[PDB]
Each structure stands twice: as C-alpha cells, then as structure tokens.
Coordinates of C-alpha atoms and ligand atoms in Angstrom, one line a residue:
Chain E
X13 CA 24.9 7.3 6.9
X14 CA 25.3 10.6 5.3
X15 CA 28.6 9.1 3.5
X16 CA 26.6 6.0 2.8
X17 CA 23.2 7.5 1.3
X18 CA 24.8 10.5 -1.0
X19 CA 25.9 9.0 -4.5
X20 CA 24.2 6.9 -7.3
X21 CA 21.7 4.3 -7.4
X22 CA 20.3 1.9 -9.6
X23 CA 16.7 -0.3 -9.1
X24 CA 15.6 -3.5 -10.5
X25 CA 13.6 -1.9 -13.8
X26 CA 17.2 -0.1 -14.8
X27 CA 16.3 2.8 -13.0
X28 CA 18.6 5.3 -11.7
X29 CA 18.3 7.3 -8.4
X30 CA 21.5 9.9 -8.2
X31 CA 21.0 11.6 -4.3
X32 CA 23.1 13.8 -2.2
X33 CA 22.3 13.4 1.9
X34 CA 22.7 16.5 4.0
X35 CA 24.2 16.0 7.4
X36 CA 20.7 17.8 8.4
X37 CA 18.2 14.5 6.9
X38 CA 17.9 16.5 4.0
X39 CA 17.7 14.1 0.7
X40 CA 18.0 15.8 -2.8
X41 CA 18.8 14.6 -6.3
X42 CA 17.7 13.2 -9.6
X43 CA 15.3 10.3 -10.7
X44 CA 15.4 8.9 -14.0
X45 CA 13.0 6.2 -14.9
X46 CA 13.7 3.4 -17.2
X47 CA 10.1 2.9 -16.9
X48 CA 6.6 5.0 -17.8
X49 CA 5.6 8.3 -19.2
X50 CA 8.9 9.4 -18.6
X51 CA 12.1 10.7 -20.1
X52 CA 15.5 12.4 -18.9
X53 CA 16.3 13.1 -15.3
X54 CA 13.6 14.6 -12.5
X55 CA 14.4 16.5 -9.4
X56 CA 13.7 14.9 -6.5
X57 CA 13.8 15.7 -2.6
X58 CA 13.2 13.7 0.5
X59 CA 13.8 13.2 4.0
X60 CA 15.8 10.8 5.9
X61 CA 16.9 10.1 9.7
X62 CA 20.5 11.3 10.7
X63 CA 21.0 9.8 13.9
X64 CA 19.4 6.4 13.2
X65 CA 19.9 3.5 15.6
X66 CA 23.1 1.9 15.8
X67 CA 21.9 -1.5 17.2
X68 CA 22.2 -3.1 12.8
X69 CA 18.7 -1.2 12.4
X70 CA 18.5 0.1 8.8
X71 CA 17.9 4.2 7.8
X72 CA 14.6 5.1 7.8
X73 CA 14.4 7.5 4.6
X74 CA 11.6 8.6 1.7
X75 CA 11.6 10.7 -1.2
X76 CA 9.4 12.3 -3.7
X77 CA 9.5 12.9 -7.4
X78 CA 6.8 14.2 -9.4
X79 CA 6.6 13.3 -13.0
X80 CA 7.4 17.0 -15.0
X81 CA 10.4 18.2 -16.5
X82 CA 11.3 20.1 -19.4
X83 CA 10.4 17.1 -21.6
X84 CA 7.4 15.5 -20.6
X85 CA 4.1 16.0 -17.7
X86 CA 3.2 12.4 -16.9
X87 CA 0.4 14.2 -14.3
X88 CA 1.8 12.2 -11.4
X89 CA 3.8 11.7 -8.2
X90 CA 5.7 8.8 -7.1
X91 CA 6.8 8.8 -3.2
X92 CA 9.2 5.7 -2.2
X93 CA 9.7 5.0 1.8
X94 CA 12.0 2.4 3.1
X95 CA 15.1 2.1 4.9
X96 CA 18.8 2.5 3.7
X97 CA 20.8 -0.9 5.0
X98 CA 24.9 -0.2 4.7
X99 CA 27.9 -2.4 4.0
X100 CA 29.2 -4.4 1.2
X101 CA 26.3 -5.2 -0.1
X102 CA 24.6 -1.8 0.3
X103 CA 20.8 -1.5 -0.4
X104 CA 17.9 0.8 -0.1
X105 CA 14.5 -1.1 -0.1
X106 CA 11.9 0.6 -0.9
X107 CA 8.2 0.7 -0.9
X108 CA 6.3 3.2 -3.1
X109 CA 2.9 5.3 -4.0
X110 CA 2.2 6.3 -7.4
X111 CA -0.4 8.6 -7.8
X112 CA -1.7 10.5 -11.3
X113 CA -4.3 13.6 -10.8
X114 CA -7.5 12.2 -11.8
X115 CA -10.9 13.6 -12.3
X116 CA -13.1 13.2 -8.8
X117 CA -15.1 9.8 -10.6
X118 CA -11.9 8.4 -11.0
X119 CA -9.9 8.7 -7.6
X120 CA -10.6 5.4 -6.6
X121 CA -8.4 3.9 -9.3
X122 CA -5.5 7.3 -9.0
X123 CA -2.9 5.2 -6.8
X124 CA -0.4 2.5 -7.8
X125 CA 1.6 0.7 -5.4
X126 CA 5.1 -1.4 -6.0
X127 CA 8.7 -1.6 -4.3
X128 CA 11.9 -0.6 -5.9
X129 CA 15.2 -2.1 -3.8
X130 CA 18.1 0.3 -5.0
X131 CA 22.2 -0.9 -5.1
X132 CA 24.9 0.8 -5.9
X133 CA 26.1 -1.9 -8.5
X134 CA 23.8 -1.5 -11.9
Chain P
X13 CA -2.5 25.7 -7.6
X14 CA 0.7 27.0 -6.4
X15 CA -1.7 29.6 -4.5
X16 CA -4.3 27.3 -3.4
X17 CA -1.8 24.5 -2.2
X18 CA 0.3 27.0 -0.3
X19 CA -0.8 27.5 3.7
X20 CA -2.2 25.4 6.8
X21 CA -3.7 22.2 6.2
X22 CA -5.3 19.9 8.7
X23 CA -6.0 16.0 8.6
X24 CA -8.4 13.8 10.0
X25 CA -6.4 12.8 13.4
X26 CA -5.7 16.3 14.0
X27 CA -2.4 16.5 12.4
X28 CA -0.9 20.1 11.2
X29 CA 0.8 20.5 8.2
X30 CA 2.2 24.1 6.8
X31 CA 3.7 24.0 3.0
X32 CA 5.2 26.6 0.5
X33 CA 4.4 25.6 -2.5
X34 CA 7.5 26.8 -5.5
X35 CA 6.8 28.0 -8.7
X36 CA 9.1 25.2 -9.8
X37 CA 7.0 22.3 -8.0
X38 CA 8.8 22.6 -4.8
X39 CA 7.0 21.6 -1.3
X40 CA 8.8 22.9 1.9
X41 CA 7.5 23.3 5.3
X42 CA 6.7 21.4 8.6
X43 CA 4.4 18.7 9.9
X44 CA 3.2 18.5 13.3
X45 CA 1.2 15.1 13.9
X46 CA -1.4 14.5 16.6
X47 CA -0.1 11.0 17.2
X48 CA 2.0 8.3 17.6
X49 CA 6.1 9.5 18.3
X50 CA 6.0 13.1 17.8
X51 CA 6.4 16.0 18.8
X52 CA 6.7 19.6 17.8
X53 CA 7.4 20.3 14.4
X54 CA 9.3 18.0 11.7
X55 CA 10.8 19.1 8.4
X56 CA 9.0 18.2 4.9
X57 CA 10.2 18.3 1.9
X58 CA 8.5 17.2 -1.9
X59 CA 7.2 17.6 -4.9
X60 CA 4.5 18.6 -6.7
X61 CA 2.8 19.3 -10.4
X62 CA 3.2 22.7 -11.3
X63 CA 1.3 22.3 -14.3
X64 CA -1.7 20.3 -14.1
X65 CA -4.5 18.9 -16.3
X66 CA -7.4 22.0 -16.5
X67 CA -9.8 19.1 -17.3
X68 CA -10.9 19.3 -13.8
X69 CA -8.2 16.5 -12.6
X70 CA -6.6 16.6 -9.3
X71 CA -2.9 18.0 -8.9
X72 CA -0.6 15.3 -7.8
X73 CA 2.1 15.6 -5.2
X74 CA 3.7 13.9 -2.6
X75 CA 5.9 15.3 0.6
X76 CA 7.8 13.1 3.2
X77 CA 8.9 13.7 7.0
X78 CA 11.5 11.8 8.8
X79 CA 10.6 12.0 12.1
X80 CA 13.7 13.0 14.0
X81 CA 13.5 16.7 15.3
X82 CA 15.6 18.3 18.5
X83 CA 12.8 16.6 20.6
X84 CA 12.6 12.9 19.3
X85 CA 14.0 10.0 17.2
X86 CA 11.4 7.9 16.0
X87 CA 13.6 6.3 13.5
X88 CA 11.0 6.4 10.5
X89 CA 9.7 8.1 7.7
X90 CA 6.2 9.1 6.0
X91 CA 5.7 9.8 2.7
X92 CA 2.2 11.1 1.6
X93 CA 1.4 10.5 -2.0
X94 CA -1.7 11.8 -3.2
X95 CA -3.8 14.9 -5.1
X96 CA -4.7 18.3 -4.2
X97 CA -8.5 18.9 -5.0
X98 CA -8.9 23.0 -5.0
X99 CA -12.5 24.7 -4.6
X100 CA -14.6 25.7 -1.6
X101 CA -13.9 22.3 0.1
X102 CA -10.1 22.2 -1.0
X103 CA -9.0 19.0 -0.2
X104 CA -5.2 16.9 -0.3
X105 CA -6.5 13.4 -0.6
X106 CA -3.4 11.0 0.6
X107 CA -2.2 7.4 0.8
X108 CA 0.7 7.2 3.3
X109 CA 4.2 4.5 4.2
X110 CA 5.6 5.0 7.2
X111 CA 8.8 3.1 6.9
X112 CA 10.4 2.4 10.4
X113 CA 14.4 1.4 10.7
X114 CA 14.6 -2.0 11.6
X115 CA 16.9 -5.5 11.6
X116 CA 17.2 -7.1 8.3
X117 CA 15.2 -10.1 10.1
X118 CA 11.9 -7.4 10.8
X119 CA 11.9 -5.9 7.3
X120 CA 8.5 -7.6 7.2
X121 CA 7.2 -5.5 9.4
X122 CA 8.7 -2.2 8.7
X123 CA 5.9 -0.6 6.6
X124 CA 2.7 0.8 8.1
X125 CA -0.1 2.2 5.4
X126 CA -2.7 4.3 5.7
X127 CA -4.6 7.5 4.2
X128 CA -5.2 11.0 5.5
X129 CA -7.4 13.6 4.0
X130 CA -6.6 17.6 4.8
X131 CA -8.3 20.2 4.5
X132 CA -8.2 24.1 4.8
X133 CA -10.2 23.7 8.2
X134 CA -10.1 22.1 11.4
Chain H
X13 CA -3.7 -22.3 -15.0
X14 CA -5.9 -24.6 -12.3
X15 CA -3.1 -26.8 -12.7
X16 CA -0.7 -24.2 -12.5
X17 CA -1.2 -22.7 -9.4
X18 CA -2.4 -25.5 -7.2
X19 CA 0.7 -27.1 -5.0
X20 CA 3.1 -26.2 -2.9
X21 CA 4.6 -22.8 -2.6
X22 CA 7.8 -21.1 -0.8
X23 CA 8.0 -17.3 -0.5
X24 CA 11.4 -15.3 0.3
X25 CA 10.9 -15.6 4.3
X26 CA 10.7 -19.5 4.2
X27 CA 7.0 -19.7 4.4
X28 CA 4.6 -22.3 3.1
X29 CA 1.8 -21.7 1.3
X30 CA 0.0 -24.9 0.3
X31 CA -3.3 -24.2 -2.1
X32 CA -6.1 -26.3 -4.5
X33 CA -7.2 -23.7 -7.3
X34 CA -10.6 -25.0 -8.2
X35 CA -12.3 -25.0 -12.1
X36 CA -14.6 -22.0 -10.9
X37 CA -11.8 -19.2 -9.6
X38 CA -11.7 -20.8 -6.1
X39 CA -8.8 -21.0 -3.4
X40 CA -8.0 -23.0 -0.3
X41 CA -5.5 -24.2 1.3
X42 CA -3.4 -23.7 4.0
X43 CA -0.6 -20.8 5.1
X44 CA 2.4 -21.7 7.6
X45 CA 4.5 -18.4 7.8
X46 CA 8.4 -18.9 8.9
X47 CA 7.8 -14.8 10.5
X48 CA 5.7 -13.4 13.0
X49 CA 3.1 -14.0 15.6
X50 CA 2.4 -17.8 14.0
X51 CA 2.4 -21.3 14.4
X52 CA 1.7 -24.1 12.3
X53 CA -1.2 -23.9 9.6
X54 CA -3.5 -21.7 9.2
X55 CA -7.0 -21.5 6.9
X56 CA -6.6 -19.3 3.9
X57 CA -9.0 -18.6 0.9
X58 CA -9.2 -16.6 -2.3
X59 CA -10.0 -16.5 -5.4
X60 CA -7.9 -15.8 -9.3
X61 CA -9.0 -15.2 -12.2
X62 CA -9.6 -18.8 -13.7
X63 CA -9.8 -17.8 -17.6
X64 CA -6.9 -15.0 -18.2
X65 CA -5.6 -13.4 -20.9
X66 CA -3.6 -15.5 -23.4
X67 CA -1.3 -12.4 -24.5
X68 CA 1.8 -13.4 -21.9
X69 CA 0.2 -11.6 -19.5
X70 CA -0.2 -12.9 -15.4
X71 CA -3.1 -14.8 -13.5
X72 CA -4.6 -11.8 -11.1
X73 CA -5.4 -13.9 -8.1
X74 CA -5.5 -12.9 -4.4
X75 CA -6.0 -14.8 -0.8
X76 CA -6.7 -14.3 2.7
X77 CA -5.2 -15.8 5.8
X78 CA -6.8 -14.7 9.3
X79 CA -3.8 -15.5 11.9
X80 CA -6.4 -17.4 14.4
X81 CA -5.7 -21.3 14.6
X82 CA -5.8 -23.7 17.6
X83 CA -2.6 -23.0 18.8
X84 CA -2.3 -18.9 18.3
X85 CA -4.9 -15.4 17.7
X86 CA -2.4 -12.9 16.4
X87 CA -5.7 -10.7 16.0
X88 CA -4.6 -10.1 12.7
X89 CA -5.7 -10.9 9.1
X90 CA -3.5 -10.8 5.5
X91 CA -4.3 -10.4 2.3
X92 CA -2.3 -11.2 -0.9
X93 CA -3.4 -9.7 -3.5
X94 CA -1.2 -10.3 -7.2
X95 CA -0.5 -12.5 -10.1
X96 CA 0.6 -16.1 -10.7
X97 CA 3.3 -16.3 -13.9
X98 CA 3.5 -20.0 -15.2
X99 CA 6.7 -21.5 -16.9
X100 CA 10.0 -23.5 -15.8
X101 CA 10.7 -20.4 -13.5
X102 CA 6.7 -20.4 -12.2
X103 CA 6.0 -17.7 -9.6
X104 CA 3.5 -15.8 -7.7
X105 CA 4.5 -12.4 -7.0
X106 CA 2.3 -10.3 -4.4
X107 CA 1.7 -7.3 -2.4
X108 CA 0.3 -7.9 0.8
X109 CA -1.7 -5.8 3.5
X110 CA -1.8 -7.4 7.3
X111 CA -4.8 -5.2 9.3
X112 CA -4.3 -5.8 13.3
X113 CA -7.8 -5.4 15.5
X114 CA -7.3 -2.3 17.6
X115 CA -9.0 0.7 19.2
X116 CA -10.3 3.0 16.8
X117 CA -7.4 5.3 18.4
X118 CA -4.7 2.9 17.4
X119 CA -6.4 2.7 14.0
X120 CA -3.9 4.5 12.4
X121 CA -1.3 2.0 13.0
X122 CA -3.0 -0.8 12.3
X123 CA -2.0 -1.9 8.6
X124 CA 1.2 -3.4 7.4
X125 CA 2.3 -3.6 3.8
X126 CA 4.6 -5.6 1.9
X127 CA 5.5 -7.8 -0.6
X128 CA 6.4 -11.3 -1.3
X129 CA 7.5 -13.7 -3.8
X130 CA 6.9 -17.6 -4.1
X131 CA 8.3 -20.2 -6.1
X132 CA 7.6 -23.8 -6.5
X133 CA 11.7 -24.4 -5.4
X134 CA 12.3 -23.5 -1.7
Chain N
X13 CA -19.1 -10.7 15.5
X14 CA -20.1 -13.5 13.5
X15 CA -23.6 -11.8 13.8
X16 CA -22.7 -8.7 13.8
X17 CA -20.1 -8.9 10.9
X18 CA -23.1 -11.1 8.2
X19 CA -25.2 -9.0 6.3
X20 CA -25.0 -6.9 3.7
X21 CA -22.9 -3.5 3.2
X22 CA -22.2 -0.5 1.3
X23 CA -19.1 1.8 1.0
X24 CA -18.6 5.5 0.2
X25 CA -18.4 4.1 -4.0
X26 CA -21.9 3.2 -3.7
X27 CA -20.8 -0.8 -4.2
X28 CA -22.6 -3.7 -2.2
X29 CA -20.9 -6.2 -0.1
X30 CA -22.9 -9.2 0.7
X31 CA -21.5 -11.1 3.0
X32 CA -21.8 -14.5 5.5
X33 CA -19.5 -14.5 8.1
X34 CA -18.9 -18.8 9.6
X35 CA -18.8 -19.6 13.2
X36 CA -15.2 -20.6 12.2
X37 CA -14.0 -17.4 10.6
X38 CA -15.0 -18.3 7.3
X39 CA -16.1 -15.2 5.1
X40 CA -18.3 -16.2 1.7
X41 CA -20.9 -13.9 -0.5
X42 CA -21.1 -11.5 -3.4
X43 CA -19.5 -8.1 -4.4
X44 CA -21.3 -5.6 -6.8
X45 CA -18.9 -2.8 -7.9
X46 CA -20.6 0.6 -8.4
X47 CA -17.2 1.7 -10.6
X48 CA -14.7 -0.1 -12.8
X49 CA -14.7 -3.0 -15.4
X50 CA -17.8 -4.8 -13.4
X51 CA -21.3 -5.4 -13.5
X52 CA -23.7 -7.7 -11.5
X53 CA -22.6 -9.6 -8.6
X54 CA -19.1 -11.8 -8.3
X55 CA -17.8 -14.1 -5.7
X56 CA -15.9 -13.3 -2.6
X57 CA -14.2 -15.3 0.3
X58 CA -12.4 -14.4 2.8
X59 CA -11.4 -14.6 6.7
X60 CA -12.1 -13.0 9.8
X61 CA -10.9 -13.5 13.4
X62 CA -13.5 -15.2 15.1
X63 CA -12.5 -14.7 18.7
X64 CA -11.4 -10.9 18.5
X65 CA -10.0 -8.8 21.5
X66 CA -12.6 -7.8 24.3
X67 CA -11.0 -4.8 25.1
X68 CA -13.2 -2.5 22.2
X69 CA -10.9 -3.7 20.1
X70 CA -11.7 -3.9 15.8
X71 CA -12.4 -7.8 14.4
X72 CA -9.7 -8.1 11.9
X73 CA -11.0 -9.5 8.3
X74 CA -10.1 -9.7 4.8
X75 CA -11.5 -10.7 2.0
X76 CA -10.6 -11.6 -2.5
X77 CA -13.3 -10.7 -5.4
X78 CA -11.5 -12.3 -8.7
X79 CA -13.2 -9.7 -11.1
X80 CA -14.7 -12.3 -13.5
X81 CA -18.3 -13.6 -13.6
X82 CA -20.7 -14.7 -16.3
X83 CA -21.0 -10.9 -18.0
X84 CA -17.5 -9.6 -17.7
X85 CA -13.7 -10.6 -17.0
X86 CA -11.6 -7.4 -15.9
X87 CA -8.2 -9.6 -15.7
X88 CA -7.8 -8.2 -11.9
X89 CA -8.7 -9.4 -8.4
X90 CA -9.1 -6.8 -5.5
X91 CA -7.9 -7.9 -1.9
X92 CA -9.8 -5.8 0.9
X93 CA -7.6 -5.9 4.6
X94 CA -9.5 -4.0 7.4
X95 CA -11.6 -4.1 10.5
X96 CA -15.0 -4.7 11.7
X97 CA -15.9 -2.3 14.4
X98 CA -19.5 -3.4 16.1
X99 CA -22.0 -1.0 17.3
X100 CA -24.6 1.6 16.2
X101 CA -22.6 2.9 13.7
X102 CA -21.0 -0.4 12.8
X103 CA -18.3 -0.3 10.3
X104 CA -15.7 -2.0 8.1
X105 CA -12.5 -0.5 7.5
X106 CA -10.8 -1.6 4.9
X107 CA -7.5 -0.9 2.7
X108 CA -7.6 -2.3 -0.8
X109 CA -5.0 -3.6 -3.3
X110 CA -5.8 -4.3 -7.1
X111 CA -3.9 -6.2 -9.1
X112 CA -4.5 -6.9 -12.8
X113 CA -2.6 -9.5 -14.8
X114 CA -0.1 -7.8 -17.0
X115 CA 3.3 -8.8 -19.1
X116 CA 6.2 -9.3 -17.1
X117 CA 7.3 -5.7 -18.9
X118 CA 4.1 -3.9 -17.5
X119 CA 3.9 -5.5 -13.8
X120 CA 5.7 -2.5 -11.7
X121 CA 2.2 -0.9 -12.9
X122 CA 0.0 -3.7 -12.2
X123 CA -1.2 -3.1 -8.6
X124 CA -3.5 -0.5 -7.6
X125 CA -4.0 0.5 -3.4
X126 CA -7.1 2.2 -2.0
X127 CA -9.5 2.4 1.0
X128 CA -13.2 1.7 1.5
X129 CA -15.5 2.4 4.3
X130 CA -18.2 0.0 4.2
X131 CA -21.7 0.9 7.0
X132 CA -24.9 -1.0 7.5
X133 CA -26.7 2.2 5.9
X134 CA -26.0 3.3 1.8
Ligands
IR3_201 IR1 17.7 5.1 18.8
IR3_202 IR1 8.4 -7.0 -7.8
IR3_203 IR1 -2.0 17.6 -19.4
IR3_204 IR1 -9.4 5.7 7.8
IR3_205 IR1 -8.9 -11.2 -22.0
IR3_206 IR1 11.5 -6.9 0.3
IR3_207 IR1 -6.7 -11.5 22.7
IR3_208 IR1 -10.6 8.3 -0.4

C-alpha cells in the first residue's frame, strides 16, 4: 500500500492532502486547508501499517498537522485516523481531532471532532 | 515548550511515551502502551506548536503510532490530539482514535475513542 | 422544525430511525439498525433545540438508543448527537459515540465513534 | 442499577446531573452546566441498559440536554455516552459530543468531543 498511499489527495471541503509513504509506515507530506484559520501548505507526518492484512481489510493509518507555517498560527492541531481502502475507487476515510491551546477554564470546549474521506479525484 | 515537552511521559493506564520535541514543531520518539495488542516499543511521529499563545493557553499537538513493530501487527492506528500544559504538574491532556483495518462492511466499527492524560511522573 | 424532523428516516447503512419531535424540544421514537448486535426496534429518546436560529443555520438535536429490547442486550448504548438541515434535500447529519458495559480494565476500549447521515429517501 | 444509577450527580466541571433512571431503561431529569452558554436547569433524557452484565461489568447509558430553556438558547445540544459503575465510589463515565447548529459553510466546525466523570460526591 506504499504505492497506493504516497501521492495527492483531495477531501470533501476542497481540501488537499499531498503524502509520501515510506516502505517503513512512515507518512510525511503537506496539508492545505480549504477551510479555517489557515492559508498555504502545512507539514504534516504520520504513521501507517506496512504489512496490513490482505483478507480486503483497509490500511490502518493517522497523521498530524498542526496549524503554523510561515503565514499564519491558528494555535491548533488537527490529528485524522482512519484506514486507506485501494482500488479504482481509492479512498482514505477519516476520522479527526481538532484541538486549539486554550486557557485551563476553557479546556472543556478545546476539541472539535469531524471526518474527512480523501480520493484521489478532486 | 520545546524543553518542557521533550522527555518521558506517562499516562493513566501506565503507558510510556518518549518524544523529541524539534525546534521546527517536530515530535519523534516511541510509545510503549500498557494494554491492549502491544508490545515493546512503536514509532511516533507528529506535530506540534512551536510558538504558542504566552496568555497562559495550552500548546497544542498531536502524535500518532501505528501499531506494527518487529513484535506485532495490530493492524491499527492512534492518534493523540490534545495540549501540553507546562508547570510543576506538566501535563499532555489527550483525546484519542484508534482506527483498526477492517472490511468495508465493519467500517462502523472501526474507531475506538478515548482520552489519556500524561504526566512527568508515574 | 417540529414538523421537519418528525417521520421517517434512512441513514447510509440502511437503518431506520422513526421519531415524533414534540412542541417543547422532545424526542421519541424508535431505532432499527441494518449493522450490528440488533434486531428489530429499539426505544430511543432526545431532545433538539425546538426554536433555532433563523440565519440558515442547522437544528442542534441529539438522541439516545440503549441496544436492550425483547429480542437482544448488546450491552451497549449510542448516542447521536448533530443537526437536522430542512429543504427538498432535508437531512440529519450526526456523530455518534456507542459506550459497551465492561470491566473497568476493558474501559479503555469501550467507546466507538462514528458518523452517520439520514435522509428522508432511503 | 435502576437504584443505584437515580439520583443526583456531579462531574469534575462542577455541573449537576439530576437524574431518574425507569424500571425500563428510561433516563429523564435536569442538567445544570457550571461552564458555557447556560444557566439554571434544562431537560435531559436518555437510555440505559436495564439488565447489565453480572460479571462487574459497567451499565451502559446515554443521555441528550438540548441547551435551551426559559433563560437562554445556546443553539447546541450535548450527547453524553458512558457507563455506570456501582459501588462505594460509584461513577459515571462518560464521553461527550457538542454540536451547535451552524451554516452548511461552518458545519466541519460544529461538533465539539469531551469527557466527564460524574460521582455521588461534588
Ligand atoms: Ir494480519
Ligand atoms: Ir460530514
Ligand atoms: Ir498567538
Ligand atoms: Ir477515562
Ligand atoms: Ir438565535
Ligand atoms: Ir463513513
Ligand atoms: Ir449479558
Ligand atoms: Ir479532561
């Protein structure tokens, strides 16, 4: 899945997700966000499984990107974990955890939640 | 917080996890957790703000493990999202998706949540 | 949006979800999911927000189904939590968290999350 | 656990949960927020299992507050999923997820996800 994984995605909210996969489970790349305090690409890295079961079972993978670059410091971190399916119709589906740094009073209220299923057509 | 994120943190089922933290926003290191299908050490990789709010907010970051190591294959993946609270009870405050591979027709149930909390001791 | 929300519902997986919004911010009704540990109908309840903003924006509503009837105990219990968007293309799009009874040991595995999507058509 | 689960508790926000647990599984009462866009009491229902696992075993529960009353509508309704673990430190676990109604534009950041401890004592 190393062949697979390693090129450019794109999300439902116009997103795109450009990754290289390392034949070790090494993920690494660039988010850009169509979306949010955001602007320009992001460096991301992540993990995913290399020898994953060959009975149709999807990837296991995740990723992380936190929200500074050179333009902008949207004081956050977005992780996304889901599973890479191959094939024609490639997708990876995703679920995700946004959280912003927040004062102590306000931790409760630090964490968004959503899903993001990548393709390769977008 | 590159200093005080840096070195051996511990959560609340007894997991270990040991992270560089880069100048750049960089995490690297390893996680070892107390339970479910591990064991050893597992690669992490991810990301965090290198440049935080000094109003007293929380630094946010976020780090996954795919858990496949020379020992095991659990064909999934964690990603901890969450904020790194320094002092003299430095804590890493997480929510957690562990995405296991699975069948198109058991996507449902791919995705377990939860939270950890780490600190310095334990 | 009383009138809205009260019918018959379909979500991506085939399941049922059959609900009465009352005048005061109630819901009943009944869930049959096409997935899982389940047979026929099961109790749900919950509650939306019965006077929402008039900007475009969605109906925050959420529900509960606890997976005991008279046919199955899945020892399990689901909650919906998300917003109903009215219009020809009406739907209800959710995020969901399914807790599992177990030993405080196995308490770390004990929560699923996921989303779904229902329409009126399906 | 119907007798066990009824009564009144109180998490780590300082908030109140008032709560009636039916010999059927039915879950009804009042939630007082200690934090966010509330004040007073607002209505709750929900579901637990009533006829959990004997094996020590959690009860699993859920519940919806639809944050709108006579003094305040926050647009939002929080789903809590856990379990209810008996005993002399008797507890409710619980996972959250918030969602506020937003424009179709905003909804990938309409849904927050958090956990709460709920005790007997607080
Ligand atoms: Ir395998
Ligand atoms: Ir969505
Ligand atoms: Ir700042
Ligand atoms: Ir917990
Ligand atoms: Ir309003
Ligand atoms: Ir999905
Ligand atoms: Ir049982
Ligand atoms: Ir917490």
């Amino acid at each position: 899945d190393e062949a697979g994984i390693t090129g450019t995605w794109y999300n439902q909210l116009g997103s795109t997700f450009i990754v290289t996969a390392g034949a070790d489970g090494a993920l690494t790349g660039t988010y850009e966000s169509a979306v949010g305090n955001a602007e320009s690409r992001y460096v991301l890295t992540g993990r995913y499984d290399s020898a994953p079961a060959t009975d149709g079972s999807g990837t296991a993978l995740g990723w992380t990107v936190a929200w500074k670059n050179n333009y902008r410091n949207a004081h956050s971190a977005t992780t996304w974990s889901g599973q890479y399916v191959g094939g024609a119709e490639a997708r990876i589906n995703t679920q995700w955890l946004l959280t912003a740094g927040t004062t102590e009073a306000n931790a409760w209220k630090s964490t968004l939640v959503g899903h993001d299923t990548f393709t390769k057509v977008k």
